[PDB]
Amino acid sequence: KIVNIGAVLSTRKHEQMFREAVNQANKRIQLQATSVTHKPNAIQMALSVCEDLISSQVYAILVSHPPTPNDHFTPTPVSYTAGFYRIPVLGLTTRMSIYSDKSIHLSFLRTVPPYSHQSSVWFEMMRVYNWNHIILLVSDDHEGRAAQKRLETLLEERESKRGPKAEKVLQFDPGTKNVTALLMEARELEARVIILSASEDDAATVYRAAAMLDMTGSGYVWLVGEREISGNALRYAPDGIIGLQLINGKNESAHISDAVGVVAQAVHELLEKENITDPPRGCVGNTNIWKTGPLFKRVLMSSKYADGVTGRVEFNEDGDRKFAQYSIMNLQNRKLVQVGIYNGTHVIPNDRKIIWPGGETEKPRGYQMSTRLKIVTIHQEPFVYVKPTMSDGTCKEEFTVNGDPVKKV
Amino acid sequence: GTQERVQNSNKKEWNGMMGELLSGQADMIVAPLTINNERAQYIEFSKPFKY
Amino acid sequence: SIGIAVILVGTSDEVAIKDAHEKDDFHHLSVVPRVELVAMNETDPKSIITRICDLMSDRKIQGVVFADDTDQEAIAQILDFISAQTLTPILGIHGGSSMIMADKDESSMFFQFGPSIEQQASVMLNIMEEYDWYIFSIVTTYFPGYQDFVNKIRSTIENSFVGWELEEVLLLDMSLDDGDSKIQNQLKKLQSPIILLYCTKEEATYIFEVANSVGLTGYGYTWIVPSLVAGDTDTVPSEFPTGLISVSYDEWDYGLPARVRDGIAIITTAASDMLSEHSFIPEPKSSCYNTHEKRIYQSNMLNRYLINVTFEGRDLSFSEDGYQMHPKLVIILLNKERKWERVGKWKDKSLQMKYYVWPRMDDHLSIVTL
Ligand SMILES: *[C@@H]1O[C@H](CO)[C@@H](O)[C@H](O)[C@H]1NC(C)=O
Ligand SMILES: *[C@@H]1O[C@H](CO)[C@@H](O)[C@H](O)[C@H]1NC(C)=O
Ligand SMILES: *[C@@H]1O[C@H](CO)[C@@H](O)[C@H](O)[C@H]1NC(C)=O
């Protein structure tokens, strides 16, 4: 028949681009294009969702980021609103991992991967450089908590040199100002490779206090995710910092096209199935679930698009991107560069040579054993005698029956 | 030091000096410490130095 | 002179409610609160938003309650986001509202009268007590909240003295179709006389069908479920084996204007304790469109007092989650007919039954001693 899809964007240009994209995919069951702008308030948009859906009887809606930098809520309302009728929605630039959940957002599949897996990749950079000891530094939040969950599952996935074995995690507090306390515990430990993942704004404070803390010289090694490089963070980053980028950072039309293609590849398999009951556009009238909701989602979960403008697009077990590509970028004398490229297990180095903070050109051992350790001890009668000191500060020296000096640490 | 639940949450932590070792206040327990399953779960014990 | 909105959906004794509005004594604190009722049908979210906007913009609303009659939780979630993007507290006092979401915003201010999930686990253990079923096994439906359920259960079992002997926690979901065979297999290993279930009003029918398809019937078993698979006035298919037990609260004798009085009283006493001592009162010129610029007066203090309140001797202290401290609960039983006889009352960590023994449907002997 004729099926209609909708999307919400922030550029008339990409609107015409999506129109052209569906005109082209028409070569591959007619599809009807519908699109709406965004607004500087969740109210009008939360109205527009049915204001246009009911008009169109949509079968899937596409969504991306508005000009708002954070936009932690701009993909919220449009999601669960359609969830009110099990209307599978697709997103592009939704990285903030809230939507990672299956429960709260049973009606959401994304285009890119969320920060969780871009943490997960560090496993391989650890595998190559034979590093073993890592200080994990994350903020206290749901996001950071998910990062912990992912990385811990990853490291635990070693049931078999023991490789890596994390040895501390610091519940850095969000939004704070004074930091150095935690950094002290950081310095005292025995390792150098630290992994920091936090707000794109507070890494500035972190770098400030750390450079003041002098723990940024040689021997130290860093890693970050994505948000930690850009923004004013770059204006405080010491050299040698290693950073990670996605291969398709901000390219709307690319994902738009891949999306309309994959949804065509879906609907062509959809319309040739039995019991296909149209989701009604009567959100005011109707109040039940078109079984072609979770039915639509169950059928989506098997497709494997051949090749897009972003290469092969595959979906995970939870409804998100699978097997993207990453650029292992770097900072070099206040001049960002590229160094490597990751995809899958392939971790390809390249021409330019890596550097490490302090100017060293080796791959430092990441840790040197201490030689001044501490000791605990209880007060037990024949094993550990406890006695107050003499007035001089030490305590009086005695002798056994053999007359020998008695050690009195 | 033993093990126990805390804060009426699903957190089971280690009171006492053994717990101190677990958290990073020192790196050796020289004292009349005993040996048993629970403690031997995650701490490495030297060979026994007094029976 | 605060404004308080009260909405209804469905059938209800509207006049009786408007009358019981003036049921209490608000003499000794300057509030003079206004009231404004509205009825409506069950059309859509947009209706809801439009209406709440009209109310808050019109009568200088500073707090809303809500009731309903269906079995839809999404609407609740919607209202949650409302309280998110809207700095006023909201009280889901009755109906499909009071169904418990998974969580709340770190900033939203929405609450609902009803048991927590931990409250239910606790009370059902207290009922495992009086009648001495000391061995059980549990099964779930992969609704994500289940992890908290089982964890609270185990971390209350491991500590105490009595001989809690649980066995073989099981986890099943055939969300992938035609996995039902696996179900019929994985359920065969339930040797305990007591089974516990966290499921959905939809799946449970099929689940009990398969259960009788294995042998677990009212001969030598007995089941327990939380309210989230029950409806008191509601009815159920025959697949529910007779004699099923579960737990709800005192709807059967509280779901009435007195709840409305309770809500009005609580918002009033909060407004009195917090705003008088602080001498301020957040009174937005309540827009609904163009509210992103209205957060200038961060609430940040109503919460700081909305949890420590009381009146009429009844304590209404609220916990951070969205449940209360302790609401009066009831335990009900499937009878011969499809009816829920009121069996047991519960309040203040205390359980009170109407029996000393469990009526059962022969190798079960009395025995004397000395
Ligand atoms: C942080 O606090 C320490 C003392 O705890 C103080 O010495 C230091 O100057 C403070 N720095 C910042 C950036 O707040
Ligand atoms: C997006 O990517 C496509 C190919 O992948 C390219 O043709 C186009 O110019 C890119 N546009 C932007 C803005 O990056
Ligand atoms: C609650 O309020 C009463 C009376 O105002 C006061 O005595 C009590 O300490 C308060 N408790 C809390 C937790 O605020």
PDB file of all heavy atoms in Angstrom, chain C residues 247-275, unseen atoms left out:
ATOM      1  N   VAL C 247      -1.921  -9.234  47.435  1.00  0.00           N
ATOM      2  CA  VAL C 247      -1.865  -8.088  48.330  1.00  0.00           C
ATOM      3  C   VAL C 247      -2.218  -6.825  47.559  1.00  0.00           C
ATOM      4  O   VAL C 247      -1.757  -6.627  46.431  1.00  0.00           O
ATOM      5  CB  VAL C 247      -0.471  -7.958  48.966  1.00  0.00           C
ATOM      6  CG1 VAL C 247       0.589  -8.043  47.895  1.00  0.00           C
ATOM      7  CG2 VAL C 247      -0.353  -6.649  49.715  1.00  0.00           C
ATOM      8  N   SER C 248      -3.047  -5.982  48.163  1.00  0.00           N
ATOM      9  CA  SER C 248      -3.299  -4.631  47.681  1.00  0.00           C
ATOM     10  C   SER C 248      -3.401  -3.740  48.909  1.00  0.00           C
ATOM     11  O   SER C 248      -2.993  -4.118  50.010  1.00  0.00           O
ATOM     12  CB  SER C 248      -4.557  -4.566  46.812  1.00  0.00           C
ATOM     13  OG  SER C 248      -5.044  -3.239  46.771  1.00  0.00           O
ATOM     14  N   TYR C 249      -3.943  -2.545  48.741  1.00  0.00           N
ATOM     15  CA  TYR C 249      -4.201  -1.683  49.883  1.00  0.00           C
ATOM     16  C   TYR C 249      -5.704  -1.432  49.993  1.00  0.00           C
ATOM     17  O   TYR C 249      -6.509  -2.008  49.257  1.00  0.00           O
ATOM     18  CB  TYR C 249      -3.403  -0.384  49.780  1.00  0.00           C
ATOM     19  CG  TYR C 249      -3.887   0.547  48.714  1.00  0.00           C
ATOM     20  CD1 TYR C 249      -4.798   1.550  49.005  1.00  0.00           C
ATOM     21  CD2 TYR C 249      -3.441   0.423  47.412  1.00  0.00           C
ATOM     22  CE1 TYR C 249      -5.249   2.403  48.031  1.00  0.00           C
ATOM     23  CE2 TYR C 249      -3.884   1.273  46.428  1.00  0.00           C
ATOM     24  CZ  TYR C 249      -4.790   2.263  46.741  1.00  0.00           C
ATOM     25  OH  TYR C 249      -5.238   3.115  45.761  1.00  0.00           O
ATOM     26  N   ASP C 250      -6.070  -0.524  50.891  1.00  0.00           N
ATOM     27  CA  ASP C 250      -7.431  -0.380  51.388  1.00  0.00           C
ATOM     28  C   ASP C 250      -8.340   0.357  50.430  1.00  0.00           C
ATOM     29  O   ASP C 250      -9.264   1.033  50.895  1.00  0.00           O
ATOM     30  CB  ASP C 250      -7.432   0.334  52.741  1.00  0.00           C
ATOM     31  CG  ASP C 250      -6.534   1.550  52.754  1.00  0.00           C
ATOM     32  OD1 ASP C 250      -6.530   2.302  51.757  1.00  0.00           O
ATOM     33  OD2 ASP C 250      -5.838   1.763  53.767  1.00  0.00           O
ATOM     34  N   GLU C 251      -8.041   0.327  49.130  1.00  0.00           N
ATOM     35  CA  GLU C 251      -8.956   0.885  48.138  1.00  0.00           C
ATOM     36  C   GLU C 251     -10.406   0.547  48.452  1.00  0.00           C
ATOM     37  O   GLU C 251     -11.255   1.444  48.510  1.00  0.00           O
ATOM     38  CB  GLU C 251      -8.587   0.375  46.743  1.00  0.00           C
ATOM     39  N   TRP C 252     -10.693  -0.729  48.721  1.00  0.00           N
ATOM     40  CA  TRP C 252     -12.062  -1.176  48.947  1.00  0.00           C
ATOM     41  C   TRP C 252     -12.770  -0.388  50.039  1.00  0.00           C
ATOM     42  O   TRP C 252     -13.995  -0.478  50.157  1.00  0.00           O
ATOM     43  CB  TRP C 252     -12.073  -2.665  49.300  1.00  0.00           C
ATOM     44  N   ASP C 253     -12.033   0.365  50.848  1.00  0.00           N
ATOM     45  CA  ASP C 253     -12.655   1.240  51.829  1.00  0.00           C
ATOM     46  C   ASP C 253     -11.929   2.565  52.020  1.00  0.00           C
ATOM     47  O   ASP C 253     -12.104   3.194  53.069  1.00  0.00           O
ATOM     48  CB  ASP C 253     -12.785   0.511  53.169  1.00  0.00           C
ATOM     49  CG  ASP C 253     -11.573  -0.323  53.490  1.00  0.00           C
ATOM     50  OD1 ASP C 253     -10.630  -0.339  52.678  1.00  0.00           O
ATOM     51  OD2 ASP C 253     -11.569  -0.985  54.545  1.00  0.00           O
ATOM     52  N   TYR C 254     -11.122   3.012  51.059  1.00  0.00           N
ATOM     53  CA  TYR C 254     -10.497   4.326  51.150  1.00  0.00           C
ATOM     54  C   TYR C 254     -10.528   5.104  49.841  1.00  0.00           C
ATOM     55  O   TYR C 254     -10.355   6.326  49.860  1.00  0.00           O
ATOM     56  CB  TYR C 254      -9.053   4.200  51.636  1.00  0.00           C
ATOM     57  CG  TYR C 254      -8.411   5.537  51.903  1.00  0.00           C
ATOM     58  CD1 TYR C 254      -8.613   6.196  53.103  1.00  0.00           C
ATOM     59  CD2 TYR C 254      -7.611   6.148  50.947  1.00  0.00           C
ATOM     60  CE1 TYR C 254      -8.032   7.425  53.345  1.00  0.00           C
ATOM     61  CE2 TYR C 254      -7.030   7.376  51.181  1.00  0.00           C
ATOM     62  CZ  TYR C 254      -7.242   8.010  52.381  1.00  0.00           C
ATOM     63  OH  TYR C 254      -6.663   9.232  52.616  1.00  0.00           O
ATOM     64  N   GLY C 255     -10.790   4.445  48.718  1.00  0.00           N
ATOM     65  CA  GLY C 255     -10.710   5.099  47.426  1.00  0.00           C
ATOM     66  C   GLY C 255     -11.838   6.087  47.238  1.00  0.00           C
ATOM     67  O   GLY C 255     -12.764   5.864  46.452  1.00  0.00           O
ATOM     68  N   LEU C 256     -11.767   7.185  47.966  1.00  0.00           N
ATOM     69  CA  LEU C 256     -12.928   8.035  48.109  1.00  0.00           C
ATOM     70  C   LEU C 256     -12.453   9.450  48.409  1.00  0.00           C
ATOM     71  O   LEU C 256     -11.245   9.671  48.557  1.00  0.00           O
ATOM     72  CB  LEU C 256     -13.815   7.457  49.209  1.00  0.00           C
ATOM     73  CG  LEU C 256     -13.295   7.525  50.642  1.00  0.00           C
ATOM     74  CD1 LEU C 256     -13.922   8.710  51.342  1.00  0.00           C
ATOM     75  CD2 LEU C 256     -13.555   6.231  51.393  1.00  0.00           C
ATOM     76  N   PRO C 257     -13.354  10.432  48.479  1.00  0.00           N
ATOM     77  CA  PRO C 257     -12.919  11.812  48.732  1.00  0.00           C
ATOM     78  C   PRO C 257     -11.967  11.986  49.903  1.00  0.00           C
ATOM     79  O   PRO C 257     -11.257  12.996  49.946  1.00  0.00           O
ATOM     80  CB  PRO C 257     -14.241  12.544  48.985  1.00  0.00           C
ATOM     81  CG  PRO C 257     -15.220  11.810  48.163  1.00  0.00           C
ATOM     82  CD  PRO C 257     -14.778  10.379  48.099  1.00  0.00           C
ATOM     83  N   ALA C 258     -11.928  11.056  50.859  1.00  0.00           N
ATOM     84  CA  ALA C 258     -11.026  11.222  51.994  1.00  0.00           C
ATOM     85  C   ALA C 258      -9.579  11.267  51.538  1.00  0.00           C
ATOM     86  O   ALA C 258      -8.753  11.967  52.131  1.00  0.00           O
ATOM     87  CB  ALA C 258     -11.227  10.103  53.010  1.00  0.00           C
ATOM     88  N   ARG C 259      -9.250  10.522  50.485  1.00  0.00           N
ATOM     89  CA  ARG C 259      -7.929  10.657  49.892  1.00  0.00           C
ATOM     90  C   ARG C 259      -7.702  12.082  49.412  1.00  0.00           C
ATOM     91  O   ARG C 259      -6.611  12.642  49.581  1.00  0.00           O
ATOM     92  CB  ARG C 259      -7.776   9.666  48.742  1.00  0.00           C
ATOM     93  N   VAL C 260      -8.730  12.688  48.822  1.00  0.00           N
ATOM     94  CA  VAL C 260      -8.614  14.060  48.345  1.00  0.00           C
ATOM     95  C   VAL C 260      -8.383  15.006  49.510  1.00  0.00           C
ATOM     96  O   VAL C 260      -7.563  15.933  49.434  1.00  0.00           O
ATOM     97  CB  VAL C 260      -9.870  14.445  47.550  1.00  0.00           C
ATOM     98  CG1 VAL C 260      -9.684  15.793  46.887  1.00  0.00           C
ATOM     99  CG2 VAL C 260     -10.193  13.362  46.539  1.00  0.00           C
ATOM    100  N   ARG C 261      -9.116  14.798  50.600  1.00  0.00           N
ATOM    101  CA  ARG C 261      -8.878  15.579  51.802  1.00  0.00           C
ATOM    102  C   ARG C 261      -7.447  15.401  52.281  1.00  0.00           C
ATOM    103  O   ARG C 261      -6.791  16.370  52.677  1.00  0.00           O
ATOM    104  CB  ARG C 261      -9.868  15.176  52.893  1.00  0.00           C
ATOM    105  N   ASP C 262      -6.943  14.168  52.238  1.00  0.00           N
ATOM    106  CA  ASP C 262      -5.579  13.901  52.676  1.00  0.00           C
ATOM    107  C   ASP C 262      -4.581  14.700  51.854  1.00  0.00           C
ATOM    108  O   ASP C 262      -3.658  15.319  52.396  1.00  0.00           O
ATOM    109  CB  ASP C 262      -5.289  12.406  52.568  1.00  0.00           C
ATOM    110  N   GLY C 263      -4.763  14.705  50.538  1.00  0.00           N
ATOM    111  CA  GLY C 263      -3.844  15.437  49.684  1.00  0.00           C
ATOM    112  C   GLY C 263      -3.904  16.936  49.904  1.00  0.00           C
ATOM    113  O   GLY C 263      -2.869  17.612  49.985  1.00  0.00           O
ATOM    114  N   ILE C 264      -5.114  17.484  49.981  1.00  0.00           N
ATOM    115  CA  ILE C 264      -5.235  18.913  50.231  1.00  0.00           C
ATOM    116  C   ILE C 264      -4.573  19.267  51.550  1.00  0.00           C
ATOM    117  O   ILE C 264      -3.834  20.253  51.653  1.00  0.00           O
ATOM    118  CB  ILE C 264      -6.709  19.336  50.201  1.00  0.00           C
ATOM    119  CG1 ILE C 264      -7.287  19.072  48.817  1.00  0.00           C
ATOM    120  CG2 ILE C 264      -6.838  20.798  50.564  1.00  0.00           C
ATOM    121  CD1 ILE C 264      -8.574  19.801  48.555  1.00  0.00           C
ATOM    122  N   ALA C 265      -4.799  18.448  52.572  1.00  0.00           N
ATOM    123  CA  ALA C 265      -4.209  18.722  53.871  1.00  0.00           C
ATOM    124  C   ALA C 265      -2.693  18.679  53.804  1.00  0.00           C
ATOM    125  O   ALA C 265      -2.015  19.508  54.423  1.00  0.00           O
ATOM    126  CB  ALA C 265      -4.732  17.724  54.903  1.00  0.00           C
ATOM    127  N   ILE C 266      -2.134  17.724  53.063  1.00  0.00           N
ATOM    128  CA  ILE C 266      -0.683  17.604  53.068  1.00  0.00           C
ATOM    129  C   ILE C 266      -0.050  18.777  52.337  1.00  0.00           C
ATOM    130  O   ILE C 266       0.937  19.358  52.812  1.00  0.00           O
ATOM    131  CB  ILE C 266      -0.236  16.250  52.492  1.00  0.00           C
ATOM    132  CG1 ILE C 266       1.257  16.074  52.708  1.00  0.00           C
ATOM    133  CG2 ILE C 266      -0.532  16.126  51.025  1.00  0.00           C
ATOM    134  CD1 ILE C 266       1.721  14.681  52.433  1.00  0.00           C
ATOM    135  N   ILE C 267      -0.617  19.174  51.194  1.00  0.00           N
ATOM    136  CA  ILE C 267      -0.051  20.321  50.489  1.00  0.00           C
ATOM    137  C   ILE C 267      -0.192  21.575  51.340  1.00  0.00           C
ATOM    138  O   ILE C 267       0.708  22.424  51.384  1.00  0.00           O
ATOM    139  CB  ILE C 267      -0.697  20.486  49.101  1.00  0.00           C
ATOM    140  CG1 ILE C 267      -0.061  21.650  48.349  1.00  0.00           C
ATOM    141  CG2 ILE C 267      -2.174  20.718  49.209  1.00  0.00           C
ATOM    142  CD1 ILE C 267      -0.539  21.770  46.922  1.00  0.00           C
ATOM    143  N   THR C 268      -1.290  21.675  52.085  1.00  0.00           N
ATOM    144  CA  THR C 268      -1.495  22.831  52.942  1.00  0.00           C
ATOM    145  C   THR C 268      -0.455  22.891  54.050  1.00  0.00           C
ATOM    146  O   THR C 268       0.173  23.933  54.271  1.00  0.00           O
ATOM    147  CB  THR C 268      -2.901  22.779  53.525  1.00  0.00           C
ATOM    148  OG1 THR C 268      -3.835  22.500  52.474  1.00  0.00           O
ATOM    149  CG2 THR C 268      -3.250  24.089  54.175  1.00  0.00           C
ATOM    150  N   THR C 269      -0.270  21.787  54.773  1.00  0.00           N
ATOM    151  CA  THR C 269       0.655  21.816  55.898  1.00  0.00           C
ATOM    152  C   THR C 269       2.086  22.005  55.431  1.00  0.00           C
ATOM    153  O   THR C 269       2.888  22.633  56.134  1.00  0.00           O
ATOM    154  CB  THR C 269       0.537  20.546  56.740  1.00  0.00           C
ATOM    155  OG1 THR C 269       1.454  20.621  57.838  1.00  0.00           O
ATOM    156  CG2 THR C 269       0.851  19.310  55.914  1.00  0.00           C
ATOM    157  N   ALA C 270       2.423  21.494  54.248  1.00  0.00           N
ATOM    158  CA  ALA C 270       3.732  21.798  53.690  1.00  0.00           C
ATOM    159  C   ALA C 270       3.866  23.289  53.427  1.00  0.00           C
ATOM    160  O   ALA C 270       4.860  23.915  53.817  1.00  0.00           O
ATOM    161  CB  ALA C 270       3.952  20.999  52.409  1.00  0.00           C
ATOM    162  N   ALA C 271       2.862  23.882  52.771  1.00  0.00           N
ATOM    163  CA  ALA C 271       2.910  25.311  52.489  1.00  0.00           C
ATOM    164  C   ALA C 271       3.024  26.122  53.767  1.00  0.00           C
ATOM    165  O   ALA C 271       3.630  27.199  53.770  1.00  0.00           O
ATOM    166  CB  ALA C 271       1.671  25.735  51.702  1.00  0.00           C
ATOM    167  N   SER C 272       2.457  25.623  54.859  1.00  0.00           N
ATOM    168  CA  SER C 272       2.525  26.363  56.111  1.00  0.00           C
ATOM    169  C   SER C 272       3.894  26.233  56.767  1.00  0.00           C
ATOM    170  O   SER C 272       4.492  27.239  57.160  1.00  0.00           O
ATOM    171  CB  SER C 272       1.426  25.893  57.061  1.00  0.00           C
ATOM    172  OG  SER C 272       0.198  26.539  56.773  1.00  0.00           O
ATOM    173  N   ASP C 273       4.409  25.010  56.898  1.00  0.00           N
ATOM    174  CA  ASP C 273       5.688  24.832  57.577  1.00  0.00           C
ATOM    175  C   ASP C 273       6.822  25.472  56.793  1.00  0.00           C
ATOM    176  O   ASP C 273       7.641  26.206  57.358  1.00  0.00           O
ATOM    177  CB  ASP C 273       5.973  23.349  57.798  1.00  0.00           C
ATOM    178  CG  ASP C 273       7.270  23.109  58.549  1.00  0.00           C
ATOM    179  OD1 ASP C 273       7.792  24.058  59.167  1.00  0.00           O
ATOM    180  OD2 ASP C 273       7.771  21.965  58.523  1.00  0.00           O
ATOM    181  N   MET C 274       6.888  25.211  55.490  1.00  0.00           N
ATOM    182  CA  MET C 274       8.032  25.638  54.693  1.00  0.00           C
ATOM    183  C   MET C 274       7.996  27.134  54.393  1.00  0.00           C
ATOM    184  O   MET C 274       8.964  27.852  54.657  1.00  0.00           O
ATOM    185  CB  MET C 274       8.084  24.837  53.388  1.00  0.00           C
ATOM    186  N   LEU C 275       6.879  27.614  53.850  1.00  0.00           N
ATOM    187  CA  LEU C 275       6.861  28.947  53.259  1.00  0.00           C
ATOM    188  C   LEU C 275       6.727  30.037  54.313  1.00  0.00           C
ATOM    189  O   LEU C 275       7.193  31.162  54.108  1.00  0.00           O
ATOM    190  CB  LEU C 275       5.739  29.030  52.231  1.00  0.00           C
ATOM    191  CG  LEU C 275       6.057  28.108  51.056  1.00  0.00           C
ATOM    192  CD1 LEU C 275       5.048  28.262  49.945  1.00  0.00           C
ATOM    193  CD2 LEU C 275       7.471  28.363  50.550  1.00  0.00           C
TER     194      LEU C 275
END
